[PDB]
Paper text:
Here we present four in situ and one isolated cryoEM structures of the trimeric spike of the cytoplasmic polyhedrosis virus, a member of the non-enveloped Reoviridae family and a virus historically used as a model in the discoveries of RNA transcription and capping. CPV has two functionally essential components located along the icosahedral 5-fold axis: the RNA-dependent RNA polymerase (RdRp) inside and the RNA capping turret outside;25,27 a trimeric spike is attached to the latter. Each spike monomer has four domains: N-terminal, body, claw, and C-terminal.
In the closed spike, the tip of the claw domain that contains the membrane fusion loops points toward the capsid direction, with the RGD-containing CTD visible, though covered; in the opened spike, the claw domain rotates ~96° and points away from the capsid, while the CTD becomes likely flexible, as it becomes invisible in our structure. The root of the trimeric spike plugs into the iris of the pentameric turret like a bottle cork. The final part of the monomer, the CTD, is a helix-turn-helix. Within the trimeric spike of CPV, it is sandwiched by the body sub-domain 2 of the same subunit and the claw domain of the adjacent subunit through complementary surface charge. However, the RGD motif of the CPV trimeric spike is covered in the putative penetration-inactive state (i.e., closed spike) and exposed in the putative penetration-active state (i.e., opened spike), while the integrin-binding motifs known in other viruses are always exposed. In our structures of the CPV trimeric spike, we observed the PPPDE core in the body sub-domain 2, though its active site is buried inside the trimeric spike. Additionally, we extracted free spikes already detached from the virions, visible in the background of the SA-CPV micrographs. The reconstruction result shows that the majority of these particles are in closed spike conformation, indicating that the conformational change of the trimeric spike was not caused by spike detachment from the virion.
Author numbering: 26 to 1239
Amino acid sequence: NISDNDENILKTLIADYNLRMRRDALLGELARLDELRDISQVKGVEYKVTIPLLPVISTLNQHEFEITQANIETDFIADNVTFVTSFVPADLDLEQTIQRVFFRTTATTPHFQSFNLVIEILNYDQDSGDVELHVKIMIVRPNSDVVNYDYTWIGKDYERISVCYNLISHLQRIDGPHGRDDEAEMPIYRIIRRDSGSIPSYASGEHLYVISSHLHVDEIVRRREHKSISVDVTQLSLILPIIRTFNPVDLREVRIEDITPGIEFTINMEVSTYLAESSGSHVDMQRAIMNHADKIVGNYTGQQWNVQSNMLSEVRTQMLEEEDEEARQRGDYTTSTLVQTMAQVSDLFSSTILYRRAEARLDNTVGAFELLRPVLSIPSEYVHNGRVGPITNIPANASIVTSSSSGAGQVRNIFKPIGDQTINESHFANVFSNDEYAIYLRFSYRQAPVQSETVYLQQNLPSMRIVSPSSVSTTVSTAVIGGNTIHINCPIRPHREDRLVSGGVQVPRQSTAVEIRVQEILIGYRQATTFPIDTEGRLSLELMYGLESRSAVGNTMSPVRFVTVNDGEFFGLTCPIDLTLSTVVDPSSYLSDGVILVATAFEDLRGYAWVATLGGDWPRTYNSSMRAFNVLTGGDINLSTEYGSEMTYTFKVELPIVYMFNNMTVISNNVPRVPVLGVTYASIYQDSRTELEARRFLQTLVFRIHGNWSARIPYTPGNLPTRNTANQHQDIQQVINDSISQELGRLSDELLNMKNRLDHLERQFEMFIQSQESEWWEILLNVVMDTVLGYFSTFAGNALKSAQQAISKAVGYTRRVLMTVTKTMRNGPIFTRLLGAKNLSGQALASLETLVESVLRSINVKKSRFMSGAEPLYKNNKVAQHIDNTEKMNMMMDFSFANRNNRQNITADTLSRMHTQNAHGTSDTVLPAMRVYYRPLGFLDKRVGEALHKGITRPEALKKQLRSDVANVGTRAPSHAFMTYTDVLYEDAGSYIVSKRYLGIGELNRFGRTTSDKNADIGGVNIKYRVNKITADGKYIIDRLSHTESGYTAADVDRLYRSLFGKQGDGLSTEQKWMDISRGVDAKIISADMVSEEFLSSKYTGQMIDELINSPPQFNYSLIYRNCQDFVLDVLRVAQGFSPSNKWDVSTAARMQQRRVISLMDDLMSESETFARSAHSNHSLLQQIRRSYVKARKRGDLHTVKALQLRLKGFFQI
């Protein structure tokens, strides 16, 4: 059978196996089986090629969710928002008392009020992690109905459980049109979310389910053969959005109250970029909800496949290196120091100060300033002997007993404030603001209580008092001689069996000493840097508060420098006025009405009571006070008694002033006074008061100002801007934007003519080309000419790459192109302030200039021939917005703000709140976002850890920690990356076509040598919309186009659906497949990460991307890239105007360049019908020319090539 040498070989193979077993046992308990780990990895790859790319979902943790809620100030509603509670039992902190997730909403919703989840660990063997869990979910409905769900699970330490709660809000109906917006030539529709006379617009539902898994690692190790993981989804509740109701779920109103450390919690939302109407069909709604659920479940399953692979044997991962914060900080700090040195140099220039004439007339204006507290005074030591009073509401029914039989006791109340009531303050009252100047009134305020008599009005219907019990005391035993032993049991609000916790006190009033003394009124100019001169004018001031009033006139004004508390220092002129208003004679004249309450109601005081017994064996005095009351309110609540035949029950409350004034109401609004001099109500006086009228009467100071002034206002010196940049910039982006703003003034205003601008840009491009050492431009021109005439070259991609490298190396040319674009567009400075902390990228602008110039030099025509028409030019020329950066910027700004940017003298601060995008925050980009998204879905990227236990450690804890480490390290990679590119087209007065391009790629294989049906692949689509409609709040409403209008056939739709959802849509028509594809792309990327760049999109870069989307290359991504994010980063780089990757094959970039040039040439030939013909530019004649050219090029015939190039050039002459 075998020889002796073969037997020796067998023995050494056995010995090697034994050495492997020895090593494995040295390392610990975890398995090390390489073949089973490899089979697991291959099967996981096979599953992962099926995880859907769509829909687009954004994942946030708690911190990023809170920052996002703070960022968005308009309506914030998501079609699907899933709250996933995910945990691994080996990651839970077992020293915690409870494992809980609790979150709620502060508003009314059709289905949701609060969500509570508790995890109970019934058994947990930590040596071999065998856990038995019980999960209890509690949902409280808005009508206070409680719904309970249970889930039990027996499994392993390292397996994951996810509880997913989806809140669904579908916009099903828009009502209108209710008019026509005139700035944006669109009809106006409304979107009803709140209770009104209109039909509601939204329908709401919910979806609750649990995901569990079993990774049969123990069985696989015992039997030594692989077994696929098994994932179970349990459906707990599904409510479809069938009927339309008011109050959809707004995410700004959702609170996450408590999550036990160790539990993972994410928010997974899909929010539309613009508002759109959903389908009312039931099957369509259900597919919409289940696509969201299926993507979440697919990502869960991929993660669990990773966990099984990692448990079966050793898997090593290098974690991607994070960018160096500290090196970037040193570079930025050097740049900032250079700017400071430039400012020091510019400080050497001095010039004569030049002024300008300033005149202004202040019409009759009204302003109201509210003091910190209402003007009141609480007397000390206020005693009230009634049964009902400030503190007590004890009915006569209530049983109150004394030592004598049937002897009712008398109750009294004592109230005492704690602390000072005098206040000294100086304020800068706001008067009027303007982009030129701002007016402030400066005064000082005095208050103190004056010796007088208290005034106390008691309500016929008193509010729920703090001490309002059913009974106060009862008799337990009666003695013939000694007296009756009494037991007192007096609870305080709230009672143990109660709803809507409440309680309070009524406060006695007094009279105080008011002293308002106005010193002067000040005005400052924004751009003044030194004292103005020739200051003259007159101002009149009228004070009025309560019942008194004053008036004075100021004549002399002087140049002044003053500092406000929010805006900095101002330079201007002051108008001293010396008047005093003093209502010490009548400070207390609200006497008709005038009940004052203070609310003291707390969850922590429920069930508290005074419990004591008095009598023979018991002491004859009682003196007790609640200390929880002191903890919550820095005061006291007390009850004192003396045992005797006649007993008095003293209920004393003793509050501090600060707590009192932070908690009070001014009911008895029945007799509200009027502003003392018949002034119109100032929106802080009975303007939708809702019981706020007496506090405004007692707190608000209102004044009336009229006058005029004149002065000479200095101009800013010319050497100031660099000092300003050094003195107040925060980032390097601010330095760049400041340089742009200052350079806008250096450029000539002759550039505001189209011919001059085109000549300037041609001269810039000639400078750029003349400075090239290598001759890449001539070969590029040859490539472009061949492409136009039909001969497609393999190194068009090389030509494109050389052009992009030349552009990125010549940053001066890019800077000049950007500067002329910013100068020649409408409202350039407004735009530079709109940018904020971001910079516009000029690489794409110069890229477009180079492409257009290349084609035009090929056909031997100037650009001015294609730029003819009336203004605005992009509305009268169908190619101008595609070949010109200035017209593109104009069109994009008109689109982004619905022509609100064209209002006269509108500031960038006002315009910034008029964007037309849905759920748009000010931290978002003005132009459409264009970036790569790469984050996990349904779980965090790291685990929440623990601190090391302080005690002595034991082996099963070490084993549990190792299991947690292996379950968590390297398994939380995202399953895909993607990128979006969107371009906007103007077609008619109120019609736009928005073209969104999606490109995504799945996670790369561990084993990439397999065939392409089992490798990671890319999936992309181009989707179009039409903008015709707007809301009354200024936001666009979208209609989505069909697949035919996007260029797709039925077979194309089948291929796209397979790429984007990972399956053949079975039982779906092409209409349903396109509905799913189109609806899955309109979601918006929500993140707390901030971008610092703006990018302008172009139609021909979009064609370059469509070249990848429509005819993808035969590429093995798994073998070439380390990461699926790197591919989409390469594509995004190409989209941003940079060169193609050297990882790609040659023909990829070749085809991209051919597509962009062919698209531009078609556009130019279509436009040339105005100055050429269509009979001699027919498609049939051009096809013959192209076929002849290809044949002539393939056989080296220069005569025919030249003749055909002349024929093509002559197409554009006559």
